[PDB]
Design a protein around this ligand. Sequence first.
Ligand SMILES: Nc1ncnc2c1ncn2[C@@H]1O[C@H](COP(=O)(O)OP(=O)(O)OP(=O)(O)O)[C@@H](O)[C@H]1O
Ligand SMILES: Cc1cn([C@H]2C[C@H](O)[C@@H](COP(=O)(O)OP(=O)(O)OP(=O)(O)O)O2)c(=O)[nH]c1=O
Ligand SMILES: Cc1cn([C@H]2C[C@H](O)[C@@H](COP(=O)(O)OP(=O)(O)OP(=O)(O)O)O2)c(=O)[nH]c1=O
Ligand SMILES: [Mg+2]
Ligand SMILES: [Mg+2]
Ligand SMILES: [Mn+2]
Ligand SMILES: [Mn+2]
Ligand SMILES: [Mn+2]
Ligand SMILES: [Mn+2]
Lengths: 287, 287, 683, 683
Amino acid sequence: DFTQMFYNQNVKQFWLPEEIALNGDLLTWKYLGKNEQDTYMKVLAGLTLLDTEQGNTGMPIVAEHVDGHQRKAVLNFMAMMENAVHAKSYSNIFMTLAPTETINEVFEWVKQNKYLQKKAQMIVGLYKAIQKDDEISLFKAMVASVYLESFLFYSGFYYPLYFYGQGKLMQSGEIINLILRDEAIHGVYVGLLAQEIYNKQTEEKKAELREFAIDLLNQLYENELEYTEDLYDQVGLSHDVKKFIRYNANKALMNLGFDPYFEEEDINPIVLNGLTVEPLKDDDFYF
Amino acid sequence: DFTQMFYNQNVKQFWLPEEIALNGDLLTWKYLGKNEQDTYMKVLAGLTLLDTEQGNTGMPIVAEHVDGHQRKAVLNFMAMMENAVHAKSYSNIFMTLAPTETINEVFEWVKQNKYLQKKAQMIVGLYKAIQKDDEISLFKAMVASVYLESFLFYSGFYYPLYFYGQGKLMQSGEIINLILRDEAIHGVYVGLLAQEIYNKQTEEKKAELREFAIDLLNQLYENELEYTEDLYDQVGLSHDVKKFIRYNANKALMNLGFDPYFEEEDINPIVLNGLTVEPLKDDDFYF
Amino acid sequence: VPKWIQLNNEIMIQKDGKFQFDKDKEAVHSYFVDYINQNTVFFHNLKEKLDYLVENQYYEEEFLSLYSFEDIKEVFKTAYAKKFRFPSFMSAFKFYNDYALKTNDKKKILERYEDRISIVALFFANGDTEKAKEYVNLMINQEYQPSTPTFLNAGRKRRGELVSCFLLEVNDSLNDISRAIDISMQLSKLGGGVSLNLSKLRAKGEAIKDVENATKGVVGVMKLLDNAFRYADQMGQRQGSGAAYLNIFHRDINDFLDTKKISADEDVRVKTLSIGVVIPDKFVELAREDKAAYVFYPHTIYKEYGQHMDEMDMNEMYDKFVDNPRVKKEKINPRKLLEKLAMLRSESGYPYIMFQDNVNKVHANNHISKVKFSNLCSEVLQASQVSSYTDYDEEDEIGLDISCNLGSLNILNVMEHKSIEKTVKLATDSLTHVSETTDIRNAPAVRRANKAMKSIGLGAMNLHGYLAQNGIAYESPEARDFANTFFMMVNFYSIQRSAEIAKEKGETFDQYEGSTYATGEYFDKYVSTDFSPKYEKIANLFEGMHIPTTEDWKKLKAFVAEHGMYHSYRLCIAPTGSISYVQSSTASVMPIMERIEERTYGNSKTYYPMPGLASNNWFFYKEAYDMDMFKVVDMIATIQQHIDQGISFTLFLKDTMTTRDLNRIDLYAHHRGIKTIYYARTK
Amino acid sequence: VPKWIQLNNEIMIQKDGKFQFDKDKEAVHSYFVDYINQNTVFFHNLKEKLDYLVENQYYEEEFLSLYSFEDIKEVFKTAYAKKFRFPSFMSAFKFYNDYALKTNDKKKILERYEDRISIVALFFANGDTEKAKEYVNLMINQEYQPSTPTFLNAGRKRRGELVSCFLLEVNDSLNDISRAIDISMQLSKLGGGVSLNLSKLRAKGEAIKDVENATKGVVGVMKLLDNAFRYADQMGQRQGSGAAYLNIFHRDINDFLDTKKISADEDVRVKTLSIGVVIPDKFVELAREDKAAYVFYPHTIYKEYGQHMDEMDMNEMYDKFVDNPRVKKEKINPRKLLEKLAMLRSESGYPYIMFQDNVNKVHANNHISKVKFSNLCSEVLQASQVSSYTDYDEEDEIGLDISCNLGSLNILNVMEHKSIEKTVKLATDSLTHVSETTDIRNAPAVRRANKAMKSIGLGAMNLHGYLAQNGIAYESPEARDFANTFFMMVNFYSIQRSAEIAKEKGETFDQYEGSTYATGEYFDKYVSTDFSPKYEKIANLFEGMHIPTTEDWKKLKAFVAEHGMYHSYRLCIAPTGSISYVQSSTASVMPIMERIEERTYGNSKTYYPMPGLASNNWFFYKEAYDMDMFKVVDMIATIQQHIDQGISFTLFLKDTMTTRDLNRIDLYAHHRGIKTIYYARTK
Ligand SMILES: Nc1ncnc2c1ncn2[C@@H]1O[C@H](COP(=O)(O)OP(=O)(O)OP(=O)(O)O)[C@@H](O)[C@H]1O
Ligand SMILES: Cc1cn([C@H]2C[C@H](O)[C@@H](COP(=O)(O)OP(=O)(O)OP(=O)(O)O)O2)c(=O)[nH]c1=O
Ligand SMILES: Cc1cn([C@H]2C[C@H](O)[C@@H](COP(=O)(O)OP(=O)(O)OP(=O)(O)O)O2)c(=O)[nH]c1=O
Ligand SMILES: [Mg+2]
Ligand SMILES: [Mg+2]
Ligand SMILES: [Mn+2]
Ligand SMILES: [Mn+2]
Ligand SMILES: [Mn+2]
Ligand SMILES: [Mn+2]
């Protein structure tokens, strides 16, 4: 009942980072403190890693196991967006704002950062555990994918949105909003596929799947807290970002057909502001 | 040396089925004989069936085994074009020209056809034989992929190009020309990835891979001749189609860095109408 | 944000449900009082100002020296006696940002509107103080507007050429192509638009010195011309503009049109070169009958007949070319070519369409030559003779290249003052002076044709503004009736002034004896038909003015037979792009594109309502895109029957109109006598 | 596959671990017997063949009319008496595919090697039968090879010019730029390569008629010239090739160099125009000291001093330009510019490098002018004077352009026949005849300079071939000793022949009296130094040949002082690429690129071993990429000390070499007196 409308929405949202000129951010970037620039680079690098694996591994593997040519076409399109559009856009931003050495250093930093490695290990592990014709392993990977789309990106998205909302780094911010617009529909779509599998189960099996989903969310959440503190303490925003990731965790659960898990909190209003030819006939020659 | 350049060329060639209005083809379709309509339907179904294998297996399997983030992104983009753009385009052409019952029957016939099946299963067999961390099996699959993209499609493309060059079925011919333009670049790109593997091999292993490629080409070519007579004798075109197959076989070989196998021939003119910095150290100035 | 911009932006702020049109008078008043009066260089008296301007290489002293300073002072006082006030902000802004003389640092205003008008009048009078005062009254009343080149450059030492329209014939040879490139660069350097006829160049795949498949066709020459026009960009402020015209029966016609396709390869794309197509009646006849047509290789025709293909009558020579084996031709679909033209005009607005038989069936100088192509604005239609540029040390055979200096009557102001005759005659005198004072040092054919033909172009503007400010629909029959009567009177008085000038100077234009003016064939319709208004409402607009009758036209015909005609061409209706703002008039005889014109200058946006726009006449200011293009064609054809040259005719198309609608509009224009079609503008 | 091609491909098939070199003789014999004899038209006698060729518009009848048919028959018998046999398949293939006259349909062969040689000799002799026989003996012995234009076109009615290298000075004006474009197109239409000096054009951002920032710089003119050369691409048979030269101190040097960057935008990128840089010793001195350098705006210098920047001595005027406030200049990093040149040459092989002070420290005609730029092959170094092309109807100030007709001595054949003197004198006579019979009627400066300076280029080829076939390493001191002696003898005999021609005709070249030949300063090193071989092995190579001594050079100096010189310039070693196969020789004086050349002709691949290649001389046929470029520079400098013009010097680089190695090679060449560097070829 939904794939065709998602197909149409995905293809009509098609974009390339080159459509957005980035030289306009040069001055507002120059004006940020060293702490702010550091957090910003690292945040986008963490996002780049997530999209790299979502494009290389997550979306293609889910596409392989989901039945139906139209469902596969949507998932293939989403995969392309992840690595050919989203992951690449971050390099466009980096190449504009930062010198090569700072770019090299931040990519080295992703490799050695323990929270980023842990979250990649956990998510990619679940993708690679999918067994052919085994719907339960597929469900588990789809939960992981929804958590990546609708929860994990948001510790990263906070900062570009926070600046956009203050009228700073607005070209980079425009790119990020386009990425976010895509991930929102990706999270909903994968969520609907996960619910299909969940709804086939006995009540006993469903109870176990909810346990899996909640245990996984909590494990990812605890790691994301440490990641958030590590990045945002130097810019004074860790508590604010934490509220934002809890907000988005609830959206991820809802995409999976589950009740919200965290209590509602006031999000920084700045971040909220950050959001023809026809032939000639014979009679045409007479008047 | 080449992936970013191909990335650029691929994304700038992006298109959607909806861009070409198909209904005006009915004004020339109605004037074709039964044999012409039959051949066109059968050719179209042949292309559709082969392209589906490439979208579901060929491109995604190569993307899976190739190392490199940028290569995986380009390959993902190509897989997207197969599944999201090409497949929808072929379906659109069919739905415009034939009623539902006729489409189902043509696909039943072509699905049972000996020559179409022989080539489809030969290609798919090589994709299924790729082994993790074995570059020889990957190379063999890449050869199969290049043969599909740059050679096997062309016994089929001949007919739409033949009409397109005569002013018949111009809307569907425009679509086919866009598809063909994508397959050409797909073949060249996968060809470069195959040459990379080939160049890493010993001289004895190279000679062995050359023998593999020529042997495979021979098997496919002999089946193409039979496929060609089966479809084109009823419309009197087989002689010219055979010249077009050999010409495209030579292009496929050149994509794989190999010499042409067949002597140069002229093509039907109607189809043609359709178609290390280092710094000076203050001592370099003294001798 | 300046105060005047704030006041002007209040136009769109609707109060009581209606636009605040009165804010424009306030906007212009504030603009003046706060910018212009402040930034105007102060001089104690006219003598000091004139001495400063002449000394600092601003004003040429040649024209000023012809008058005693008392005469110059009297002319300047005459200019200021009117107390002229710009009625809207846009007019004054345009004048003081484009035409007002500014210091070399571009920080101060040396010229007011009155000073510029007085300088232009003194330049025109050529020593005649009373003539200068008449010119001052004509321009200060805004009855006549000299073209942008003449108006801006007149009397200026740094001034460029007062003529801005140039047409060049290119002969089929490397020497001629090189000379054409050189002349195009030379004329663009002067700031004038250059139009070239490429129909004589042999098609791609023709032999050079019995070597076959050597010629590159008209597209290689077009690439050369595009690069030449790009190089001579006139400081880059206004990019070099050139137009290439090709006959539809030329072999390279398809490649000629493919240069304007967006999908075209970059090695074939011609970015800076406008393209026009010349369509004889034979092509329209072939497309109407759906017959298969042929495009000919020009050099084969030239070898077979010793004359160029575009020098022959295609309606008489097409069958002979087809039946002649020695003539090389390839088959085309005329209807497919027409559809391709419509598609190209929809996509890019190109090419310009010239209906050769419509132009030449009323051409008065067919004896000199037929009109083979048009200019960059598509309204210049004159006989041209190709030049023979030979090798170095060999004498060149200089032909005739077309050029005309432009002027526009303000229809609203000419009708309000009831001064059609006097305004037309003064404009003709000023255009003649500009023509006589022009000497092009690197365009031998242009200079020779200027000396021999004495061609001038007297256009008109504010037709739609005048009609709307008088309760007349542009598409209505009354609008066409007024246009017929007014332009008949304009033609009558321009012919009378040309004959009077010929009588006073004792000379006619070269080869006048063979023209239709000399034989009287020109005056047949005027001596046989009465062009007085057929509607009482229109006839009342001409009250107080004498409308020439058949007897008056008979007298004028006899007078011309006695004394001849000084100008081979007198009337052409150019677009009149930016000078219309200064005159507060609608552009040319076209209908207005928008009721209120929104434009962004600097970082502040400005609104320009159509002159005289108000609630009462809001409905009469119908936009062109909302108009029936058939009625626009009817109006232009009504005007065109009294214009000896062409009329820049832009087609205003809605996005929903198919290529068939554009083809039908072109076919109706050809049927109705339309000579050229300028642009296909889509909303 | 052709039988001869199969025989040739057997060359690479190793037998006993050795290449089957004898298979090439079988390949050539099979090629002849199976294709050439079959496709050679049959004529009963020579009289019938000559009549058929003259009547059918194949030969020019005028030059053949100077001989009685008895003399023509004697000359043809002399050519045929030799029974010349091509030693390899590639020689005969190249001759019969490029130079052998073929029927208008290119189906049959009308000329053999003997026929072409006889026709060329009869054209050279200009009515002298004994001289024609001498020319026939020279060419059939392959001691002298006329340049490809002369060899191909001599005696042919439908022929291009026999001179194919032209150098054009461009003055800083629109008239001069347009004339330069026209002349370039006219000369490329003739098949000759055109080199243009753009150093007198003002840089980007200069004022045009006291309006600042109006100039597009040399890059806009470069785009114009590139399009002009693309258009006049020799009827498509050979794409128009042109070269642009800019002094390194020109402000547009960085933009000029950026036109050859691969990443360059298509708008700025120039595709078919070769670029060379003229580097004065001042730039090298600045880069050596790492001092900040300045690039100057040429028009500011011209206004301040009244002369062009490239017309002045940079080594003396650089400090004055830097200290002059009225001269505009831009700070640059000279070492960064050098490294940019090295990287651009590594990536694309451009630009050509002309060391201006190396050229002019030995230039014999500095009184006429300094040498400012080179040709498209970088071996032409002559004084030029810029022309002043004015407006139409004004008189043009025609200057001096550069053009020389080329011929190559076959070093191996000349040394085997011990005929340096006779071969050099006969080649000088033939080149003088070619220059005298040349008249370009669309390049006034070229025609005037050809008539006034009488410049010829006598080159040499087969230096590496001759050395390898004599067991001498190209990089050895013995090879340099032989080159020194041989080219000293060549220069001596060319000077003697020029003096003899001046005495016979009683006329020297224009402004000879001011040349170093007239004052005797040219002969200083020859009268003070000895150039006889210092190695007994090399001295033996010259046995039977008189090596001019210091006394001989003193006598020649006295003879020149008494009679003068006919040629302003005599010797230039052009690349000589296509005709090297026919001569069976190594190209120019450069070392061989590859021992066996693999070519593709159609679908058949042909194998060409280096002429004379064998097992016993394999080691001496060392490839250029494996040689030390310092030793190649030493060889070229040894040769260049006896050449009045330049030597086309290609650098052969390995892919491992950095830009620093290329810069070091360039700096060593500048140190060693190299004048120009042609190409940076990487393996
Ligand atoms: N709309 C306008 N167009 C042209 N000039 C104007 C305009 N408005 C003002 N000026 C110039 O600015 C001067 C001052 O304008 P302002 O309306 O204040 O004048 P004033 O003292 O009321 O009398 P007057 O209208 O006779 O000048 C005017 O004399 C005229 O020179
Ligand atoms: C020289 C040249 C000419 N042309 C075109 C431009 C001219 O319109 C056309 C004629 O060239 P011309 O300059 O007139 O050549 P030609 O007069 O010597 O030869 P012919 O008498 O046979 O015409 O050829 C090219 O396309 N490329 C070229 O290189
Ligand atoms: C006309 C023109 C010239 N130029 C350049 C090319 C010439 O080398 C240079 C001089 O042009 P000129 O033809 O010499 O112009 P000019 O002589 O009237 O001006 P001036 O007195 O300053 O010499 O300007 C352009 O770049 N673009 C142009 O449109
Ligand atoms: Mg000609
Ligand atoms: Mg000048
Ligand atoms: Mn993403
Ligand atoms: Mn996603
Ligand atoms: Mn496909
Ligand atoms: Mn494909």
